[PDB]
């Protein structure tokens, strides 16, 4: 019948990287042939029978393509199985990178939605949005063209921890659709809530000048493993582990530093092994120098 | 009598062999009534007992929508588990979930349950007060911290006290003539020699519902629970169950042995003996 074809560790792979295609069929991983989409029954490499998983390394642009496999079925009309599921190897690093931004921003309240906009001054026929990780499938969208740029709006939601993480986008051009640009700079999409918000406070307080000290404490009865201090402007994503105090609160003191310039601060708690899942934000606090 | 409703989730990763799979089944007492399998072509929550089939489309669409979300959540929970235990992305792992409610004969809640397992071992469990957790190891202690800060117990409790009991009462009424009518076992005793001086007596119970049953062998009225071989109760395929119990007896002493059978469907317990 039907094998299960898979790419490891990722079907989206940089040129110079490595990816392996496995063809699992009748509780085995060996004796199979490969097929690209356009030549639906021309087995590739002159009908090579792969006696194990097929390791493409280093990846070249010629590895990019839309694959199926067939496993050896030695008692049947053609002697091979039906075609597998199709796996698309996408090879990146072949055009200049596009740009990725989040509207309204990269901190998304749980259950809500966010738009990730990919855009470029190169006219890309399609854009791909890819969450960083193992065995993650990309989203495709055609690029609209307007004002001398091409762009696509990827809607992400309802926000849960599965949709949070580090995202990149990519462009492809008309006649090499499995050939992807270099990746956009990454964007961390963080989900906030519903873990309870911590409390923000300053020591000795929110007003200071000169070379005097200004420490911000983020505090909570809940057992956050880490805190994140965030001042409006995006120029401080400072993170510190929490310490438990005698009164049972969990706290982290953030010493601002010798040249503190101030602004409006908020803090978030997060837990071990989950850096993209944050608590609700604390009430805001403004510091003045 | 008293009754129970249970949902069981199995989420499994199988790298290189398929995509992660989510299996959910629902039970009232010993009777499965719904299933969801993410490996189906178009996954849907689907009837598995006749008395749920006349629920409207609003019911099926709500259940299916929730099962798709749970499949997505538990696929992500498999990934989170890899990080908590520092395990490779190559291995295959299994999360199991159970929750549900027990009601009395008046239909009111007797207790609620919610337990989780990873790779076949206890992971975290909701305590009897339905407001606190018990964590089996330091990984599970992470989940407990998060669930306390997110007040997840209050959500379990609100379900266990409300929808769980109201739906179980609705289901028991829907399937009253098969769910609340105990079918008594059909019984007999068979005899096979093992030598010229000993023989097996096997006591049989067939066709009974629900699965709870007691089979016991006595010899001159004394329980042989030490020399009795009991087989696990097994399903017949038609929503009844089967079981046997066997004891080895000296040839010529068969009449000293009595098999005793207790089941809800029996007005009084049966005493059986082997008759040549």
């Amino acid at each position: 019948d039907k094998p299960f074809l898979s790419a490891w560790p990722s079907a989206v792979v940089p040129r110079g990287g490595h990816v392996t295609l496995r063809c699992h069929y009748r509780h085995r991983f060996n004796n199979f042939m490969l097929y690209k989409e356009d030549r639906i029954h021309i087995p590739i490499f002159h009908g090579r029978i792969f006696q194990e998983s097929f390791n493409m390394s280093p990846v070249t642009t010629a590895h990019a393509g839309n694959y199926t496999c067939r496993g050896s079925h030695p008692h049947s009309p053609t002697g091979w199985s039906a075609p597998s599921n199709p796996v698309v190897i996408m090879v990146t690093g072949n055009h200049r990178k596009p740009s990725l931004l989040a509207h309204p921003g990269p901190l998304v309240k749980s259950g809500e939605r966010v738009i990730l906009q990919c855009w470029s001054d190169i006219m890309f026929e399609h854009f791909f949005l890819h969450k960083e990780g193992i065995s993650k499938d990309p989203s495709r969208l055609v690029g609209q063209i307007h004002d001398g740029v091409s762009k696509a709006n990827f809607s992400i939601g309802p926000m849960m921890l599965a949709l949070a993480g580090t995202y990149r986008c990519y462009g492809s051009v008309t006649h090499t659709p499995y050939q992807l640009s270099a990746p956009s700079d990454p964007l961390d999409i963080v989900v906030t809530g519903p873990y309870e918000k911590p409390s923000l406070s300053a020591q000795p307080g929110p007003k200071v000048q000169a070379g005097e000290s200004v420490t911000l404490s983020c505090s909570s009865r809940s057992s956050y493993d880490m805190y994140h201090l965030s001042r409006e402007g995006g120029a401080h994503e400072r993170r510190l582990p929490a310490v438990r105090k005698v009164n049972r609160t969990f706290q982290a003191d953030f010493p601002l530093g010798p040249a503190t310039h101030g602004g409006t601060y908020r803090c978030f708690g997060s837990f071990r092994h989950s850096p993209y899942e944050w608590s609700d934000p604390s009430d805001p606090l403004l510091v003045s120098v | 009598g008293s009754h129970s409703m249970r949902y069981f989730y199995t989420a499994m990763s199988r790298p290189g062999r398929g995509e992660p799979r989510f299996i959910a089944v629902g039970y009232v007492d010993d009777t499965q009534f719904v299933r969801f399998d993410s490996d189906a072509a178009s996954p849907r929550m689907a009837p598995r007992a006749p008395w749920i089939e006349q629920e409207g489309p609003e019911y099926w669409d709500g259940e299916t929508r929730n099962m798709k979300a749970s499949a997505q959540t538990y696929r992500e929970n498999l990934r989170i588990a890899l990080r908590y235990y520092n395990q490779s992305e190559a291995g295959s792992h299994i999360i199991q979930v159970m929750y549900g409610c027990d009601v009395g004969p008046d239909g009111r809640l007797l207790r609620g349950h919610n337990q989780y397992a990873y790779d076949g071992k206890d992971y975290i469990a909701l305590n009897e007060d339905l407001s606190s957790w018990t964590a089996a190891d330091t990984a599970a202690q992470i989940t407990q911290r998060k669930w306390e800060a997110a007040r997840v117990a209050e959500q379990l409790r609100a379900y266990l006290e409300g929808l769980c009991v109201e739906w179980l009462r609705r289901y028991l009424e829907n399937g009253k003539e098969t769910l609340q009518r105990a079918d008594p076992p059909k019984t007999h005793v068979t005899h096979h020699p093992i030598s010229d001086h000993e023989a097996t007596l096997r006591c049989w119970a067939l066709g009974f519902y629900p699965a709870e049953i007691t089979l016991t062998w006595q010899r001159d009225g004394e329980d042989q629970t030490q020399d009795t071989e009991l087989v696990e109760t097994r399903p017949a395929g038609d929503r009844t169950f089967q079981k046997w119990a066997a004891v080895v007896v000296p040839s010529g002493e068969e009449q000293r042995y009595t098999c005793h059978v207790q089941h809800e469907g029996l007005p009084k317990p049966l005493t059986l003996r082997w008759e040549p």
Partner: peptide, 10 residues
């Protein structure tokens, strides 16, 4: 009917 736990992760 099944339990609906939107947004709850391990």
């Amino acid at each position: 009917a099944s339990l609906n736990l939107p947004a709850v992760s391990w």
